[PDB]
């Protein structure tokens, strides 16, 4: 089997991407944030505290003839921004782009934090990291990909995120028309539960490439590119007027600037992030100070190749017995 679904930015800044997902019988379609940095599939639901729902589409398990309460199971998760959610668990039929999994754990939110409430466009998350990170207790549950894998034509999924435009998540096949040149594959460590890999270096604009190992995660659920302070300082030093602002919480730059590109290495290959991809717009409405899309990972504890980086590539998440990651230009 295979599946193919369009993913769409939630706003004009590409702050996140949503992908329609069919849950239950008859289908209830929710728009979920596909997140290769976590491993829970959770949804706003009929059980979510009413004051914490503001415009989201909810899953109502009582209206699904295939829903079954997973007795005794609960879940609770936090995210990199400090947002969180928790609840109980059903199993139900879940389909993404024509690919169906029966008995998928669907984690129903009883509580969500304010940042989820405030985002009317995201009805929940669909985790695509390794199932070892799944938070269901007392019996850990498998991700959608992990459940689908044995049925797939090939044990892979691909992320093809758009810049200010829709893109695609494919399951079970590599669309050879979706990228240019060749796909360069690189080793993955699953030891921390993430798609963790090592970039071979970077360049700023038309500058020379610096060969240096940068260990980080391929994370579709993170908006920006978080890299070591040395690398980030080198980037922003090429933008007149750019500075790190403690009050704003990162690097900002004059909105009148033309940003340089940023290149990262994947083995001997190079992915070029155009400068425009690094502009996240005014820090507040009407401001001439703009927020940068490359930020320091110091204090996070890990480097994160988020959407800013991933959207510049066609990315293969290879879930073979020994997982790997593939990157191609597009
Ligand atoms: N994508 C997610 N759900 S969390 C990404 C993340 C952020 C920080 C650290 Cl330390 C690890 C992972």
Curated annotation (Swiss-Prot):
Sequence ranges assigned to domain Peptidase A1 in this UniProt record: 17-328
Active-site residues, record numbering mapped to chain: 35, 199
Coiled-coil regions, chain positions: none
Record bears the keyword Protease: yes
Molecular function in Gene Ontology: aspartic-type endopeptidase activity
Keywords: Aspartyl protease, Disulfide bond, Hydrolase, Protease, Signal, Zymogen
Disulfide pattern: 255-290
Enzyme class, UniProt record, top EC level: hydrolase
Reactions the enzyme catalyzes: Hydrolysis of proteins with specificity similar to that of pepsin A, prefers hydrophobic residues at P1 and P1', but does not cleave 14-Ala-|-Leu-15 in the B chain of insulin or Z-Glu-Tyr. Clots milk
One biological process term in Gene Ontology: proteolysis
EC identifiers of the protein: 3.4.23.22
Similarity field: Belongs to the peptidase A1 family.
Protein name as catalogued: Endothiapepsin
Lineage start: Eukaryota, Fungi, Dikarya, Ascomycota, Pezizomycotina
Originating gene: EAPA
Residues of the full protein shown: 90 to 419 of 419
């Amino acid at each position: 089997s295979t599946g193919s679904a369009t993913t769409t930015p939630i706003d004009s800044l590409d702050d996140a991407y949503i992908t329609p997902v069919q849950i239950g019988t008859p289908a209830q379609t929710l728009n979920l944030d596909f997140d290769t940095g976590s491993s829970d599939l959770w949804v706003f639901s009929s059980e979510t505290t009413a004051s914490e729902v503001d415009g989201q589409t909810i899953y109502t398990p009582s209206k699904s003839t295939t829903a079954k309460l997973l007795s005794g199971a609960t879940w609770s998760i936090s995210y990199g921004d400090g947002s969180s959610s928790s609840g109980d668990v059903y199993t139900d039929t879940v389909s993404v782009g024509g690919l169906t999994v029966t008995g998928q754990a669907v984690e129903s939110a009883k509580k969500v934090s304010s940042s989820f409430t405030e985002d009317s466009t995201i009805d929940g998350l669909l985790g695509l990291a390794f199932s070892t990170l799944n938070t269901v207790s007392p019996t850990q549950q498998k991700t959608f990909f992990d459940n689908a894998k044995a049925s797939l034509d090939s044990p892979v999924f691909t992320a093809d995120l758009g810049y200010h435009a829709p893109g695609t998540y494919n399951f079970g096949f590599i669309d050879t028309t979706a990228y240019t040149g060749s796909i360069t594959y690189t080793a993955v460590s699953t030891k921390q539960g993430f798609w963790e890999w090592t970039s071979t270096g970077y360049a700023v604009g038309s500058g020379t490439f610096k060969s240096t190992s940068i260990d980080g995660i391929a994370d579709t659920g993170t908006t920006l590119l978080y890299l070591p302070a040395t690398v980030v300082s080198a980037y922003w030093a090429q933008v007149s007027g750019a500075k790190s602002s403690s009050s704003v919480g990162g690097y900002v730059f004059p909105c009148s600037a033309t940003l340089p590109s940023f290149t990262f290495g994947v083995g001997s290959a190079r992915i070029v992030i155009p400068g425009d991809y690094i502009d996240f717009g005014p820090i507040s409405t009407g401001s001439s100070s703009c927020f940068g899309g490359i930020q320091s990972s110091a204090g996070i504890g890990i480097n994160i190749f988020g959407d800013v980086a991933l959207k510049a590539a066609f990315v293969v998440f290879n879930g073979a017995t020994t997982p790997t990651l593939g990157f191609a230009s597009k």
